[PDB]
Amino acid sequence: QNYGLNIPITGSMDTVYSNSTREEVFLTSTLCLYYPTEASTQISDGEWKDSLSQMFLIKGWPTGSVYFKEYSNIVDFSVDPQLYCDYNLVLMKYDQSLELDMSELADLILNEWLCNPMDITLYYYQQSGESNKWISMGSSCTVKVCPLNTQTLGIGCQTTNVDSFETVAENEKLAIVDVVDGINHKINLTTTTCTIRNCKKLGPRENVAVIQVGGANILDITADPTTNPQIERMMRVNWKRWWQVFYTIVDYINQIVQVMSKRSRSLNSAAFYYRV
């Protein structure tokens, strides 16, 4: 245990495999499911928590090791979603006009974000590169950004007139805003009800997987227009009955966990880098 340093490992390409770890991942981890309240509404039952738990036990997950966490809806769940858990699954009923909100939430939760504060009232901010964004979270975020010259004079906006400022996000719970990189900006965001953080994009967060229950592939986690990839952890499924959705989850839970993996930053291996 030699934390912190980046030491080069070495391995032989002729060694053999080892015994499967399926038993361990069932018997030690904790599965964790987030669903919308309309799920329980359509279920209209209420020992169904116990029913699902026992089905999970048949699949191999001990009784106390599977957690359920109802959330109201996508927009109100995206406001600081804390996945303090071990193997996270997030169901999302796709609906029209929530494409960007759902994609923002997926981008927020499926990747490790390193966030520093932002004192809007005092400093003028910047974006180091493509890996930097500003995530605003609150009850009502209305980010108004005014870019600046090299001499601290606004362009397309006056530094004193929030009317002249340009609106980039308006009255949404979660706003992962990007702007031009290398241009100082002056922000105004309603500080009493919407915090904002200057965040950097680390590697991917394998701990959580997203399940779009509704329509077609839309989730563009990569803010770059060019690349719109399809990650293994962005799963999609059709549906008419929430019972059928949950039974599919339980039946294929081993495959879902195979798609996912333990958080890289939750381990002692990542102790002195950005462990959390």
Partner 1 sequence: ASLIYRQLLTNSYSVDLYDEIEQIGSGKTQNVTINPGPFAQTRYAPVNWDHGEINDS
Ligand X SMILES: *[C@@H]1O[C@H](CO)[C@@H](O)[C@H](O)[C@H]1NC(C)=O
- Do 33 and 71 contact (CB within 8 A), yes or no? no
- Do 104 and 143 contact (CB within 8 A), yes or no? no
Both tokens assigned to 173:
């719970």
- Do 195 and 109 contact (CB within 8 A), yes or no? no
The single residue among 121, 151, 227, 230 that binds ligand X, judged by CB under 6 A, is 121
The single residue among 27, 153, 155, 162 that binds ligand X, judged by CB under 6 A, is 162
The beta strands (E) that lie in the chain are given as: 31-36, 66-71, 87-92, 111-117, 132-141, 144-147, 166-167, 172-177, 185-188, 194-204, 208-212, 234-236
- Do 174 and 79 contact (CB within 8 A), yes or no? yes
11 to 70, contacts with partner 1 by CB under 8 A?
A: 45-47
Both tokens assigned to 255:
């495959």
Is 163 near partner 1 (CB under 8 A)?
Answer: no
DSSP 8-state secondary structure symbol assigned to residue 148: B
Report in angstroms how near the CB of residue 161 gets to Ca ion at its nearest: 8
Name the residue nearer to ligand X (CB basis): 173 or 186. 186
The single residue among 131, 191, 244, 266 that binds ligand X, judged by CB under 6 A, is 191
Residue 130 annotated in ligand binding: no
Is 19 near ligand X (CB under 6 A)?
Answer: yes
The one of Ca ion, partner 1, ligand X, none whose footprint includes residue 206, by CB under 5 to 8 A per kind, is none
Residues lying near Ca ion in the complex (CB under 5 A): 101, 104, 127, 156-157, 164, 172, 174, 178, 181, 220, 222, 224, 228
Positions at the binding site for Ca(2+): 45, 47, 101, 104, 127, 156, 164, 166, 172, 174, 178-179, 181, 220, 222, 224, 227, 251
Residues lying near ligand X in the complex (CB under 6 A): 19, 120-121, 162, 188, 191
